[PDB]
Symmetry: C2
Subunit: 67 residues, 2 copies
């Protein structure tokens, strides 16, 4: 018995790294989704799916976590 | 291939019918999602997953479709 609310999932990963300065937040999609995904939130508040195994993705997360 | 945007998916259905007056509109979730679903959008913009096979759910869509 879980939420009956929708939850965002990803079905494709952005191919090339987004400019780091345009990203302000990230989150991981629900473990219920078929794919693991990182979602980068841009400064124009768009949400972009990214491959959590990619090097640049892991670096961006580390950078967003540091401050 | 798909876009790298997120997509709302459903993982549980609301058991009992919600009040018809609270519903603004509906949409079906993407066939990319593993569970088929209708999403009912309330006046406060809540997105509630529902089972399209269920009688009350198809009555509500018909009501939001014919007018």
């Amino acid at each position: 018995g879980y939420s009956s609310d929708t939850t965002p999932c990803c079905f494709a990963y952005i191919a090339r790294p987004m400019p780091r300065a345009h990203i302000k937040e990230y989150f991981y999609t629900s473990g219920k989704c078929s794919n693991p995904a990182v979602v980068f939130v841009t400064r124009k508040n768009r949400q972009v799916c990214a491959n959590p195994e990619k090097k640049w993705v892991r670096e961006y997360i580390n950078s967003l976590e540091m401050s």
